[PDB]
Design a protein around this motif. Sequence first.
Motif, short mmCIF file in Angstrom:
data_model
loop_
_atom_site.label_atom_id
_atom_site.label_comp_id
_atom_site.label_asym_id
_atom_site.label_seq_id
_atom_site.Cartn_x
_atom_site.Cartn_y
_atom_site.Cartn_z
N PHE A 155 0.85 -1.18 0.00
CA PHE A 155 0.00 0.00 0.00
C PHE A 155 0.89 1.24 0.00
CE2 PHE A 155 -3.60 -2.30 2.55
CZ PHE A 155 -3.91 -3.06 1.43
N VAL A 156 0.61 2.18 -0.90
CA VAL A 156 1.37 3.41 -1.02
C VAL A 156 0.41 4.58 -1.10
CG1 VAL A 156 3.30 2.28 -2.17
CG2 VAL A 156 1.45 3.25 -3.48
N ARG A 157 0.76 5.65 -0.43
CA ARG A 157 0.02 6.90 -0.55
C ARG A 157 0.78 7.80 -1.52
NH1 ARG A 157 -3.90 9.69 1.87
NH2 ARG A 157 -3.73 11.99 1.99
N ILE A 158 0.15 8.13 -2.65
CA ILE A 158 0.88 8.83 -3.71
C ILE A 158 0.78 10.33 -3.52
CG2 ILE A 158 0.73 6.94 -5.40
CD1 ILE A 158 -1.66 8.56 -6.70
N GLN A 159 1.67 11.07 -4.19
CA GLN A 159 1.65 12.53 -4.24
C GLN A 159 0.78 12.99 -5.41
OE1 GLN A 159 2.96 14.86 -2.27
NE2 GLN A 159 4.13 13.52 -0.91
N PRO A 160 0.24 14.20 -5.33
CA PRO A 160 -0.46 14.76 -6.49
C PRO A 160 0.49 14.83 -7.68
CG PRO A 160 -0.03 16.44 -4.80
CD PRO A 160 0.24 15.12 -4.17
N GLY A 161 -0.08 14.62 -8.86
CA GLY A 161 0.70 14.54 -10.08
C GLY A 161 1.10 13.14 -10.47
N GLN A 162 1.16 12.22 -9.51
CA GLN A 162 1.46 10.83 -9.81
C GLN A 162 0.27 10.20 -10.52
OE1 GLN A 162 3.61 9.69 -5.62
NE2 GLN A 162 4.29 8.32 -7.28
N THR A 163 0.55 9.23 -11.38
CA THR A 163 -0.47 8.54 -12.16
C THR A 163 -0.68 7.13 -11.62
OG1 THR A 163 1.23 7.91 -13.68
CG2 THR A 163 -0.07 9.85 -14.27
N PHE A 164 -1.80 6.55 -12.01
CA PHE A 164 -2.10 5.18 -11.63
C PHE A 164 -3.20 4.66 -12.53
CE2 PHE A 164 -6.00 6.30 -9.31
CZ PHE A 164 -5.75 7.61 -8.95
N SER A 165 -3.33 3.34 -12.56
CA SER A 165 -4.37 2.68 -13.31
C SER A 165 -5.53 2.43 -12.35
CB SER A 165 -3.88 1.36 -13.87
OG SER A 165 -2.86 1.60 -14.82
N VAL A 166 -6.74 2.56 -12.86
CA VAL A 166 -7.95 2.26 -12.11
C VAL A 166 -8.63 1.06 -12.74
CG1 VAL A 166 -10.29 3.02 -11.56
CG2 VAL A 166 -8.29 4.63 -11.30
N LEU A 167 -8.92 0.05 -11.93
CA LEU A 167 -9.74 -1.07 -12.37
C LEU A 167 -11.17 -0.82 -11.89
CD1 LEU A 167 -9.89 -3.79 -13.81
CD2 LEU A 167 -9.65 -4.86 -11.54
N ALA A 168 -12.01 -0.29 -12.76
CA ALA A 168 -13.38 0.04 -12.37
C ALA A 168 -14.21 -1.23 -12.28
CB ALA A 168 -14.01 1.01 -13.37
N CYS A 169 -14.94 -1.38 -11.16
CA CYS A 169 -15.65 -2.61 -10.86
C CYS A 169 -17.06 -2.30 -10.39
CB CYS A 169 -14.96 -3.40 -9.75
SG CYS A 169 -13.40 -4.09 -10.24
N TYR A 170 -17.96 -3.25 -10.64
CA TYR A 170 -19.32 -3.21 -10.12
C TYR A 170 -19.65 -4.61 -9.64
CZ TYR A 170 -19.13 1.20 -12.35
OH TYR A 170 -18.71 2.48 -12.71
N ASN A 171 -20.19 -4.71 -8.43
CA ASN A 171 -20.60 -6.00 -7.85
C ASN A 171 -19.45 -7.00 -7.85
OD1 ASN A 171 -23.73 -5.51 -7.61
ND2 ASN A 171 -23.21 -4.93 -9.71
N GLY A 172 -18.24 -6.49 -7.62
CA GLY A 172 -17.04 -7.30 -7.53
C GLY A 172 -16.49 -7.77 -8.85
N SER A 173 -17.04 -7.30 -9.97
CA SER A 173 -16.62 -7.72 -11.29
C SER A 173 -16.05 -6.54 -12.07
CB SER A 173 -17.80 -8.35 -12.08
OG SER A 173 -18.37 -9.44 -11.37
N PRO A 174 -14.89 -6.69 -12.71
CA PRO A 174 -14.29 -5.55 -13.41
C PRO A 174 -15.08 -5.15 -14.64
CG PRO A 174 -12.61 -7.14 -12.76
CD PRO A 174 -13.95 -7.82 -12.58
N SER A 175 -15.19 -3.84 -14.84
CA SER A 175 -15.80 -3.27 -16.02
C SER A 175 -14.76 -2.80 -17.04
CB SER A 175 -16.70 -2.09 -15.62
OG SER A 175 -17.26 -1.41 -16.74
N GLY A 176 -13.63 -2.29 -16.57
CA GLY A 176 -12.59 -1.79 -17.46
C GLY A 176 -11.44 -1.20 -16.68
N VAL A 177 -10.38 -0.88 -17.42
CA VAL A 177 -9.16 -0.37 -16.82
C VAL A 177 -8.77 0.92 -17.52
CG1 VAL A 177 -7.71 -1.82 -18.27
CG2 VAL A 177 -6.80 -0.94 -16.09
N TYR A 178 -8.36 1.91 -16.74
CA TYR A 178 -7.92 3.15 -17.38
C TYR A 178 -6.89 3.83 -16.51
CZ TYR A 178 -11.40 5.16 -14.20
OH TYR A 178 -12.12 5.53 -13.08
N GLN A 179 -6.13 4.71 -17.15
CA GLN A 179 -5.10 5.51 -16.50
C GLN A 179 -5.63 6.86 -16.05
OE1 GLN A 179 -2.43 3.83 -15.84
NE2 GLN A 179 -0.70 5.25 -15.58
N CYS A 180 -5.14 7.29 -14.88
CA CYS A 180 -5.60 8.46 -14.13
C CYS A 180 -4.38 9.20 -13.58
CB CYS A 180 -6.47 8.05 -12.93
SG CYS A 180 -8.22 8.03 -13.20
N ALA A 181 -4.59 10.45 -13.15
CA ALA A 181 -3.62 11.13 -12.29
C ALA A 181 -4.33 11.62 -11.03
CB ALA A 181 -2.95 12.31 -13.01
#
Lengths: 306, 306
Positions: free
Chosen positions: B103-129
């Motif tokens: 587990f890491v707490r990131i700084q603003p400006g850092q990017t990461f991927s989000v695995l968007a999920c509903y009801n415990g099942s993934p819907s898609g993956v995308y990059q964020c900052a």
Amino acid sequence: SGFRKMAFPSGKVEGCMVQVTCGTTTLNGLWLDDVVYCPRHVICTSEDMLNPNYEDLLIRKSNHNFLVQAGNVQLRVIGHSMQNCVLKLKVDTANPKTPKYKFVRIQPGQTFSVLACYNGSPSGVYQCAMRPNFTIKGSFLNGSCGSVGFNIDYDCVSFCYMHHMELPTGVHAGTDLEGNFYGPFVDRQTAQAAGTDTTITVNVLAWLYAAVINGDRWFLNRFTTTLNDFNLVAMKYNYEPLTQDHVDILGPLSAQTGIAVLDMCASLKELLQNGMNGRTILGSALLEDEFTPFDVVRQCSGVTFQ
Amino acid sequence: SGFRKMAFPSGKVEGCMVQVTCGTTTLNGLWLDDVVYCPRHVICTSEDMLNPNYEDLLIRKSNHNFLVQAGNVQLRVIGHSMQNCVLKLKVDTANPKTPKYKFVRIQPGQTFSVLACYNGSPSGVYQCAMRPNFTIKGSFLNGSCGSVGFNIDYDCVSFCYMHHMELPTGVHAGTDLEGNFYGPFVDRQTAQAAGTDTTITVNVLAWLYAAVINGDRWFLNRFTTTLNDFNLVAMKYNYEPLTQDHVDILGPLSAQTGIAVLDMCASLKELLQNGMNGRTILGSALLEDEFTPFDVVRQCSGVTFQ
């Protein structure tokens, strides 16, 4: 709310990626059941690439010439065959991670996720469209050949692209999973060049509906247009013709937003003619054409897979 | 070549997603070893949300009030605790798919991927900052709470975000995996609002180097600037100040391209002052700030994981 270029979850495909080595060439293969799929130019030598005869090159190969590695575990090749521009290496072990899958050859304008890989290991996942000129605007370096593009439908991975080559403009060419190139390209390392590309109109309209669903409305107007008159403007801007079938595909989005398809066409017409005037839509200052109507519905209704 | 918003492969995280139900609220949890991590507002009722006392609400709970499902297989909760704004449900089964993780707490400006999920099942993956105002510009609908953001470093998943709530502007707020919100936000369903956001300057510069690496050079110039004089212009355009440490981070990209960091600053200055004049960079008509220097290097050198 919000709207992103969203790729499919990649886990089902990661479990299929292997590394295939032949001579000094290393690239990626797709391991499904007891078969590894990879580009046939893996059997090329750095001097065969100008005009190879793959039937000759392949008959000169033995099973033991193919080094297939799944992680550290090496896979024995027990047979090999050519199907169009893909090589099929039969291995003595069925991939236990094989998902429910199909091979599909997509139409231009359709989107898919690419799992970019090097040496059989994934580097990242991103969303792409098959351009009207049958290139993809990918992100691929040397060694990425054999990376695949795919869609997921509930539980089933539909593989639609395998990467083969990069064209001089920095765009990419490849095949379906049965080895047929998209577009006129051939796996020969001679000059070829993409044809003139155009904008995927039905996708731009879908993304405009995505924008409305998400609260961007500034580009709407009270005008309408006929489909004929819309295509006169679209042609002028190298947009693809909008068909009645496109209009029909846009029906669900039109019904959800209460904006007739042909009215959204009149908004796009004014956007083409006046530009955006320093304004953005869904965080873009260009008209985005790599979301299908289906992509918009999935992302804006929360469709999942497994 | 080519340059895309590329997410990390999501398979390692997909194997951790579960569904957590409490009352009428269903959301996603993260199952690592024998613990499921989820937002504590799962224990809220549709009328507790205005100003809940979570310590009260939680002491009133029993283990059997938490319905945890991993696929169809249901997980027995054998204990529960609160850590800041995350709930930790101890379950009687260790997730056999648990990756190497931190587990890491990131700084603003850092990017990461989000695995968007509903009801415990993934819907898609995308990059964020992580935006400077500590929101993320995500794509999240009701039911996506508990979806996580992450980075991968060779074999190790660094989880850095868990989704909690959507702010009135359509942007998103959440916590690190130890339950501490990013920014000033609280898990109370009262008015809060993001602070004024700014553009992540060091990331824009990284993306300009990405463009050069990929053959876009039209925005370069012979000018240079001092860091002081650059920040005078950046401030005027709500760009974040560039620090000497940012300059240092940009060193590898500067060395690979032969363009001094401060020279690229002079190009960005002219881009801010004159706009882009109908031109695009890496397929964008805006200056993109959701790629870190590290993101550019990974994508342009082909770094893999496993």
